[PDB]
Each structure stands twice: as C-alpha cells, then as structure tokens.
Amino acid sequence: QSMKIADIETFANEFVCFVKVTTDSGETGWGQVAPYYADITAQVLHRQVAPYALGKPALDIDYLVDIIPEKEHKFPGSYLRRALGGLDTALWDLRGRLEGKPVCELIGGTPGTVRAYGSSMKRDITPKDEAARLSRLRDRFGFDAFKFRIGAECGRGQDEWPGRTEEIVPTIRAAMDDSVALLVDANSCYGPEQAIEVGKMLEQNGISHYEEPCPYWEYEQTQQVTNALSIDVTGGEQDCELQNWRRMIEMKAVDIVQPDICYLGGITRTLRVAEMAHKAGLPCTPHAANLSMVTLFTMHLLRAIPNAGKYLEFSIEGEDYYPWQDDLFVASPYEIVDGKATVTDLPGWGVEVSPTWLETSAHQISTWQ
Template sequence: MTSLSRLDTFHNEFVCFVKATAEDGAVGWGQTSSYNADITAAVFHRQIAPWALGQPVGDIAALVNRIERAEHKYPGSYRSRALAGLDTALWDMAGRRAGLPVTALIGGSAGALRAYASSMLRDITPEAEAERLKRICGEQGFTAAKFRIGAECGQDVDQWPGRTEAVIPAVTQALAGIDTLADANSGFSVARAVQVGRMLQDHGVGHYEEPVAWWDLEATQAVTQALEIDVAGGEQECDLATWKRLIAMRAVDVVQPDVMYLGGLSNTLKVAGWAAQAGLPCTPHAANLGLVTLCTMHLMRALPNAGKYLEFSIEGDDYYPWQRELFLGDPYAVTDGQLHVSEAPGWGVEVNPAWLERAEHRASVFGEDAGSDYARLYNATIAKGL
C-alpha cells in the first residue's frame, strides 16, 4: 500500500483545507474544523503531519488511532480539529482512487437526504423568526426547522426576558405541519430545562438539543429521564471514552457527533456504531456550509441508525461571510427540502482555486524537515518494531 508523502494546508482564520498526496501521486482534499483555523493549521503541521507522513494510507482509522496514541498527552479539541483535516483528506483520496463517493466506501449510496432548516439566531424576535422560518420552508420545501431558545451557556438567563416563552408558540404555530426542533445550547439548569421541555412537548416540538451544560452528562441524563420529548446532544464532545459513557448511561435520546469536532469520519463512524448498538439514532451536528455538512451527508447516507434529517444551516453571508466561494459549483443545492449526495468520487467537490490562491499555504513533506525530533524518533522506533 502506498504511503503518504506530502501534506499541504491552505488556511485563513476560519477555514483550513488539507491536501494529502501519496507516494503514487494520488491526491485527496479534506478540511480541519472551522474557526481558529490558523491555530489548527499550526497544530496540524506540528502534531499530526509528523506521525502521518511515510505511513500507509490504506487504513485511515488505524492511522488516526496511531496519531491519537502518539499525541496522547494532548487529547482534546485542537488535536481532534486538526486530525479531522487528515482523516477527511484520506477518505477523499480513497474515494477518488476507487472512483466512488465516500458514502459508497462505508456502505451507503448517492442520493437524497431530508434536511431541516437550522436557524443559528437568537437576536431575532419571536415574530421575525416565525415569519422567516415559515417563508424559508415555503420557498425551499423544508419539512423540518430548528429554532433557538434560552441563551448560549446562559445559566437560566434568557437572551432577553420572556423570549423563550414567546418563541415556542410563535414558531410552532407559524410552522403548523412542519416538524420543529429547539436548541438551548447549554442554556439551562436541570429544573428550568425540564420546565421548558414540558412547554416544548405541549407545543409538539420533537427534538430538544443541549438543554443543560453539555459537559454535565448526569444533568443531561436527568433531563432526558424527566421528559417525553427526544433530548439530543453530544456535538461538542471530542473524547471517545466520554462518548462511550454518554451512550452507556443513555444521557440523550439522539446522539449528535460533529464529524470535524470529533477528528473525522473514522471516529464518527465509531460513535454512530456504538449508538446503533444501544438503539439510539444519530443526527450529527453540522452548523455551517464548509466541508462538514458534505461529510455529514455522506455519513448519513450510510448509517443504519441515521436520524430523521440532516442539519442544514440557513444563515447566509452576513452571518458566515467566510463560507463564500469555498467550492466550485454548489454542493448544497436544496430541492424540495432535500440535499443530494452525488456519484462524484470522494466528497464530490473541488475546492475553489481562487480561494486557495488567497489562503496562507504551508507544507510538510516526507523526508524533508517535517516534524519534531520526538516524532522522528517514535517513527523510527515503530519502524524497527521496538
């Protein structure tokens, strides 16, 4: 099996694309998780690339696991965000090599996916949000939509007094016949979360996301046990051992791994598999139109326990100016409330050369001064079988 000879990154503050090149000339494109992408690119070249270069590209999950072990003193978000760049580039390379979309490599197929219109806004009045979601669902055919309640990590202090109590009836009445989801972004205490959850149930909302501090699994479990509505969560969690515990204790009814926060497709497949064994659906988190939503589409087309819908951000350039012109063509065209995974190989997109032209470029090359002395020593030791 051919090995990895070169890793190039192209970044600005928000996005970092990764180009992986193998010894035989095969190429794949991936992306690290968005935001602080300049920091993530530095982590990528210091802590990911040295362990990956010279390694076989055939078993992506094994390579990811190897890097996690080599960098075991640095668990957590940035290691995972950077690893996602390597993992997603190697999956793209595998797809391009096979002439298949990534979804076909993991048991799925090209085709349509039901999406929900995901609002990211809280600084919008309940009336304006109800009107906006109704219009967007009407125009684009969405049959499900998510709105925001509470305040992000708000400790029971609402975005402004009474907003939560007002937005729940306003949106659910405006969206009669459309499935509704609500996201609290860790906004509530257990007591307040249960109170709001009952309000959501009474208004027919079907999905209640991150009701309490996401890192407090026991508090999340308490809310899940107290309510009928499906409690969903897990988007921030990048630690596989914690994922196992979260699923074993059934802290949520619906798991929501984020392909990029979790280190890539390989780790997300593990979490989705554990959830399937526990009988839990997987509705991944995908909050912007960088590569994460496309990777999530390929994943969902393959999961036996895929949730009811794909998260699809409805926010435009004013909220996400950095999303502009990342790709050639539009992988995110919506038809009748659905998105489509194409038959094109890999992730099925090309990064826009004009965007790459404007980005900061770095390269780590096998055999050149790629990585730390520690990495070289470790790799030499492994190669000798010591």
C-alpha cells in the same frame, strides 16, 4: 509497496482550513478541519499530526486515527482532534478518488437524497422575524423541519432577553403546519430542574427535539432531563473524546447522539460513535452548523449509517452571519429541492475548492523526508 503519504498540505484563513494529501505516486485527496481559529488548527496539524503520518500507508486510516491521540497524549481535547479530522477526511477523499466511488459508498451507503432541517443560528432575531424567515424558506426550498434557538448559549439559566423563549416556541409553531417538524436548541442554557420545566412547555407546543438542555459536559444533568421528559433530548456536538461518548451512551444520557464529524476527529471516529449508539438503540443525527465541508461530510454519513436520524442539519444563515462560507467551492454541493439535499455519485467528496479561495490562502506543507 503500498501507497505511502508523501505530502500533507494546508490552505487556511482564520475561519477555514483545507487539507490536501498526496501519495508517493501522486494521487491526492482533499479534506477539511473544523472551522474557527483554523489558522491555529493548521499549525497543530503540521506539528502534532503530520510527523506521525508522513511515510505511512495512505489507505490505512484506522492506524493513524488510532495511534496519533496516544502519540500526543499530553494534548487531550479539541485542537488535536480538529487537526486529525482534516487528515482523516482528506484520506477518505483520496480513497474515493482511487476507487472511483463517493465516500457514502465506501462506508456502506449509496448516493441519493437526505431530508434537511433548516437550522437557525441566531438568538438575535425576534420571534416574529424568525417565523417570517422560516416561512419564506419553507416556501422557497420546501423544508419540512426547522431548528431555532431558545435560552442563551451557556446562559446559566438566563434567557437571551426576558420572555424570548416563551414567545418564540408557540410563535413558530403557529406559523407552521403540523406537517412541519420543529426542533429547538438550548446551547447548554439550563440546570436540570429548569430544563424540565422548559421541556414540558416544549411538549405543549408540538416540538419534537430538545438539543443540549444542560451544560454539555455534565452528563448527569442531561440524563435527568432525558429521563423526566417524553420529548427526545439530544446532544454531543462538542464531545470529541471516544471514552466520553462510551460513557454518555452507556448512561443513555440522551435519546439521540449528535457528534460533529470535524470536532470529533473525522469519519472513522464518527462511524465508531454511530456504531456505539446503534448498539444501544440510539439514532445518530450529526451536528453541521455551516456550509463549509462539514455539511457535505454529514450528508455522506447519513446516506450510510444504519441508525441515521431523521434529517441533516442545514444552516440557513446568509452572509451577515457566515461571510467566510461564500465561494469556498467551484460548484456548491448544497442545492436544496423539496426540502432535501443530494449526494451525487461523484468520486470522494465530489467537490472542488474554489481556485479563487485557494489563491489567497495561507499555505503550509510537510513532506516525507
């Protein structure tokens, strides 16, 4: 008898939901679904994911991740994939713990360090404040790459306020030495013509990464931008469907692919996207926008994949922006030294969810009958 999945448990609040899997012999692993409306994701997982997993071989993640999107074929898109990513990440943890190895080792890497870029999420902050803040971060933690925001999120061509973009790009560049890589993200702001003009201005100021210039669901628009520019154009964080990834990569719509491990549905599906990209010659620089487990999943992936991109996205926002990210874990795995994060040799994900966070969570369980 191979180990079977006996119980699937969730521990949630509106923001974050952890997933705990237990086998019929008592071994466990912990994962997490995508943050945001996590309490709803939890319900989807019990209702639409768990019925297909209970009683199944616990080590056969490929079966589950392959079959459940077809069992629930009337539900294409985000919520199902978010729920599946919780089960997948918990199962990889379970395996790591069984084998006594970190997830990066199971998927072909080794523990060690990863270059991080400090990622700013605010469009609210003035250019001068953002330059100040990033400079202080560079001094304190040693970051040698940063990402800041331009345009307005799905802004249909409009900036956050008049002139913010023209100001911020050279203000940050001025504050930072040429040894510091600068990245920007437009959050689907521009049509292609405008996106190209903005991109030529980025190229005048030593910016090296241009993320989501156009509505992300319009591949042709993005492809027009990639083709017209020299700056690397990057995208993919909201793309949760493998057939969509195959199409984006066939079209070479971007220079760099940026799946989000939780939005895409877990490590297994992310590894398939990274391989598709590797076959086409494209680096994979995953999206990780907060300090829930999404960052640590990404750290393990970047230690492993042959076409890992240049750095880990590492959110530098504090408690005003992500108050729900504080005290998720017994010990933070996110200490940065000399601009680098570290994957340790601890088994599985190598973290423990805070008992203080768990006491107050909404718990739900599905058990194999």
